[PDB]
Design a protein around this ligand. Structure first.
Ligand SMILES: [Ca+2]
Ligand SMILES: [Ca+2]
Length: 482
């Protein structure tokens, strides 16, 4: 195997977690004012999203400060050599469901990146499709001049001594729209407010580092049955980003398609190209799929993703994409023989990776919408195309997972089981998964987030416990490919 725990370090005793109750449309206007922290989606907000990045001999981590009454954006640097954690406290505090800080909002992660070219640090945080609106709006004017939230540092900050690793390394908002002497939140990544609408109504900050050390970023517009992915790139020389560019048109029915669709999956810079892989949700509510259908995959030969997009068979893709049929690989719907409207349930279980070796892997899951029907069916699916194969191998001999990773010659399932990290390892282009690592004692974890770098897994975890201020740990797990 070669798989084992290289280090566990405690980052803090007190990160934010929603320990209260789940509200809904009927109760979100009356949240608990007591000790407990109520929430509208999920309880997870710390050790969640793109919140962990290695840089040289450091690991950088983002989290929200624990205490329902605290909620500060935080940035820690861990020196893996000295063992020193040095933390920067930002003024911005979690603003909650539609800007009510009494209702926890699990979408509102702190995405993190460090430029290897100039040592700048970037954070995009606390965002769920916000826009400028008024008292009559869904957001009740709470996001005016603050609907996109970007913090960034001067060149060389990632590398300064611990003493110098302070807020004073981060660039304040001194724009005409500045909210004042403590405002560290930029409304554009371009540094030109002329561009603010291009940064409007976005969610899920995610960063990548190109093979030549360029930072890429993408976020998601829309939801449900009408969405688009938008991506941009860091101009290290001019210390600014480009405007967002679409992968696909939103409102696909107005751009020539038969229906609107949403995307469920991810864009990933993997094996030297910007690529994407997802399941769509069509606005068609009379077909057999209640939610998602299909698997879709494309890649760009352009360094920045600005065109030259191809499907898996190397066929030129219409860009921005309108018709999801151009890049469809297979239909998980084929693996269940229900015909009735809304009978096929595809939501959980999807992810995808491309190995260094160009082995293309997709995991999904499909069940009957109706769990009580006599002829019920549930199946997990691994679809993979080995580097030098014609077609996909598609198997139900698979127990399912929420994520898939790759390092060196191999693919991995990494997750929690009864509170303890496990690794499953298989050769790229195979379905031969084996458990090769299982932690079996010590404090247990509630949740976390994985980043793969240097043939290791950085597992950024929140420890199990009661209340809204809980410890964060970082595990470095060698994956045995190195
Ligand atoms: Ca600002
Ligand atoms: Ca449907």
């Amino acid at each position: 195997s070669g798989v084992l725990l290289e280090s566990q370090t405690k980052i803090t005793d007190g990160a934010l977690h929603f320990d209260g109750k789940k509200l809904n449309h009927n109760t979100f206007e009356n949240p608990s004012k007591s000790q407990a922290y109520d929430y509208f989606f999920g309880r997870n907000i710390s050790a969640h999203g793109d919140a962990v990045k290695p840089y040289k001999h450091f690991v950088f981590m983002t989290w929200y400060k624990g205490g329902k009454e605290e909620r500060n954006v935080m940035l820690s640097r861990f020196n893996t050599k000295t063992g020193v954690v040095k933390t920067i406290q930002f003024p911005h505090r979690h603003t909650g469901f539609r800007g009510d800080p009494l209702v926890g909002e699990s979408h509102n992660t702190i995405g993190l990146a460090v430029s290897p070219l100039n040592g700048t640090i970037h954070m995009v945080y606390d965002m769920h499709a916000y826009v400028d609106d008024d008292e009559t709006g869904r957001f009740k004017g709470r996001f005016v001049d603050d609907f996109f939230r970007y913090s960034f540092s001067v060149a060389g900050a990632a590398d300064v001594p611990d003493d110098e690793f302070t807020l004073e390394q981060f660039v304040k908002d001194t724009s005409e729209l500045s909210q004042g002497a403590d405002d560290y939140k930029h409304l554009t990544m371009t540094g030109n407010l002329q561009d603010k609408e291009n940064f409007s109504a976005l969610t899920y900050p995610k960063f990548y580092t190109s093979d030549d050390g360029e930072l890429l970023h993408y976020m998601r517009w829309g939801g449900n049955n009408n969405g688009a992915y938008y991506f941009n790139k860091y101009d290290a020389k001019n210390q600014k980003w480009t405007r967002f560019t679409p992968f696909n048109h939103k409102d696909q029915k107005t751009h020539g398609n038969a229906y609107n669709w949403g995307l469920y999956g991810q864009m990933k810079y993997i094996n030297g190209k910007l690529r994407v892989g997802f399941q769509q949700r069509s606005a068609n509510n009379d077909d057999r799929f209640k939610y998602q259908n299909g698997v879709y995959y494309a890649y760009s030969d352009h360094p920045d993703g600005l065109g030259n997009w191809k499907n898996v068979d190397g066929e030129d893709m219409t860009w921005p994409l309108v018709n999801s049929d151009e890049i469809k690989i297979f239909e998980p719907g084929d693996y269940i023989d229900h015909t009735a409207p809304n009978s096929v349930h595809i939501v959980t279980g999807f992810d995808w990776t491309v190995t260094e070796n160009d082995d293309v892997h997709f995991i999904t899951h499909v069940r009957s919408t109706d769990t009580k029907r006599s002829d019920y069916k549930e199946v997990s699916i691994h679809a993979f195309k080995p580097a030098n194969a014609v077609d996909f191998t598609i198997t139900t001999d698979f127990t399912g997972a929420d994520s898939i990773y790759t390092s060196g010659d191999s693919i991995f399932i990494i997750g929690l089981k009864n509170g303890y990290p496990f690794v499953e390892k298989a050769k790229g282009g195979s379905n031969d998964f084996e458990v090769v690592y299982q932690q079996a004692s010590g404090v247990k974890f509630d949740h976390g987030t994985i980043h793969i770098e240097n043939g290791k897994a950085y597992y950024y975890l929140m420890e199990k416990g009661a209340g809204n201020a809980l410890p964060l740990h970082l595990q470095v797990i060698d994956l045995g490919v190195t």
